[PDB]
Structure 1
Amino acid sequence: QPHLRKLRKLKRGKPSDLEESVAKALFELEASHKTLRQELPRFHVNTVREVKVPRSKKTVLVVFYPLRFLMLVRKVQRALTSELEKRHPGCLVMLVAQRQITKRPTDVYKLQKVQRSKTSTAVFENILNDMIYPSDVVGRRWRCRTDGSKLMKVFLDARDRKRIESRLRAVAYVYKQLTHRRVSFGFMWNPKLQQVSTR
């Protein structure tokens, strides 16, 4: 089927229900939508992963695409996620690029040769940027409580509050499911002066 071109060639044989639904939506958007028409033909996805957010409505459709399409996705990501979301009622769509992590070597000579973009720190912060893309991180803190825990809080610009606050809980859970790392979110109305917003 022509819509199966929006999947990696390995997945075209026996696509999943979520993958086929996303592929069909992408194929329709490549001609129906004005902005998406100029980018989607050169684009395809790897797989679609369903995430159930506890104590919340809807699910999260995590869509993995090759990292070579990062700039292509970032061009139309806000339009693309909005279109996929209206295609899938009761769902949230997150476009996450598939990134490879090289395990940290135990040798100082191998460590100097590690591609810094393949480190877990770089990959995890890039995945976080993927899931909140229209907004950007304006600050990052690590609260080290007396019991030994170290919780990371990420601050977003308070302007994007009306646009991302609903999905922040889903972003935090999907981030933990993908990176096995915890994240908390806050808002700064004056990121320059490090001024947090109360509400």
Structure 2
Amino acid sequence: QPHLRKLRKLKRGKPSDLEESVAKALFELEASHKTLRQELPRFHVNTVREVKVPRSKKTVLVVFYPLRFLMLVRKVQRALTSELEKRHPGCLVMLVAQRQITKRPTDVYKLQKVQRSKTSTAVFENILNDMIYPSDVVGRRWRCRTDGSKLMKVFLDARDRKRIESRLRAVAYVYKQLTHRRVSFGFMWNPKLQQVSTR
């Protein structure tokens, strides 16, 4: 069937129940939507994973795609994200590129040859940018409490508080499931002068 072409060739054999449902939606949109019809033909996904966020009603759909299409996805991410939501009520979709990490070497000579975009610091930062893409990070702080813990907080612009407020609980939980790191969010009106906004 033609819609299976939207998957990686490995998974065209026995797709999972989530994979082909997304594949049908992508195939149908590639011929109907006005702006998606010239980017989608070159696009195909790797896998789709389901995450259940505790203490919540909505569930999260995570879609993995090859890093080749990073610029392709960024161009149509807004339309693609909203379009998939309608086909899948009661769910939230995030598009994440699949990246690999080289473990930190112990020898000095090897450390000089590491490709910097494959370090865990760089990779985890880009994963976070994928989950909030229309918005961007305007500040970042680390809080070191007396008990010895260290908590990281990320500040977003207050101009787009209305759009992304509902999704922050889901984003924080999924980010922990992929990186095993804790994150917290806040908003800044006038980030130039570092003014945080309370409600």
TM-score (structure 2 length as normaliser): 0.99
User: Shift of the alpha carbon at 1:136?
Assistant: 0.2
Q: CA RMSD in A?
A: 0.6
The count of corresponding residues between Structure 1 and Structure 2 is: 199
Counterpart position of 1:168: 168
User: Shift of the alpha carbon at 1:157?
Assistant: 0.4
Deviation sequence 1:101-160 (CA, Å, 0-9, x none): 111111111111111110001000000000000000000111111111111100000011
User: Shift of the alpha carbon at 1:172?
Assistant: 0.4
Instruction: Provide the C-alpha distance between the structure 1 equivalents of 2:82 and 2:54, rounded to a whole number of angstroms.
Output: 23
Instruction: Provide the C-alpha distance between the structure 1 equivalents of 2:7 and 2:16, rounded to a whole number of angstroms.
Output: 11
Counterpart position of 1:126: 126
Deviation sequence 1:38-60 (CA, Å, 0-9, x none): 10111000000001010011111
Instruction: Provide the C-alpha distance between the structure 1 equivalents of 2:167 and 2:187, rounded to a whole number of angstroms.
Output: 14
Instruction: Tell me which protein shows more helix as a share of its residues.
Output: 2
Secondary structure at 1:166 match in 2: helix
Pair 1:78 & 2:71 matched: no
Structure 1: 4+ residue segments shifted above 6 A: none
Secondary structure at 1:34 match in 2: coil
Instruction: Provide the C-alpha distance between the structure 2 equivalents of 1:19 and 1:189, rounded to a whole number of angstroms.
Output: 40
Instruction: Provide the C-alpha distance between the structure 2 equivalents of 1:194 and 1:42, rounded to a whole number of angstroms.
Output: 42
User: Shift of the alpha carbon at 1:22?
Assistant: 0.7
Instruction: Provide the C-alpha distance between the structure 2 equivalents of 1:160 and 1:107, rounded to a whole number of angstroms.
Output: 45
Counterpart position of 1:24: 24
Deviation sequence 1:21-75 (CA, Å, 0-9, x none): 1111110111111111110111000000001010011111000000010000000
State the identity as a percent: 100
Instruction: Provide the C-alpha distance between the structure 2 equivalents of 1:74 and 1:107, rounded to a whole number of angstroms.
Output: 37
Deviation sequence 1:156-184 (CA, Å, 0-9, x none): 00011101110011000000000111100
TM-score (structure 1 length as normaliser): 0.99
User: Shift of the alpha carbon at 1:3?
Assistant: 0.8
Secondary structure at 2:123 match in 1: helix
Instruction: Provide the C-alpha distance between the structure 1 equivalents of 2:120 and 2:57, rounded to a whole number of angstroms.
Output: 31
Structure 2: unaligned runs, 5 residues or longer? none
Secondary structure at 1:143 match in 2: strand
User: Shift of the alpha carbon at 1:88?
Assistant: 0.5
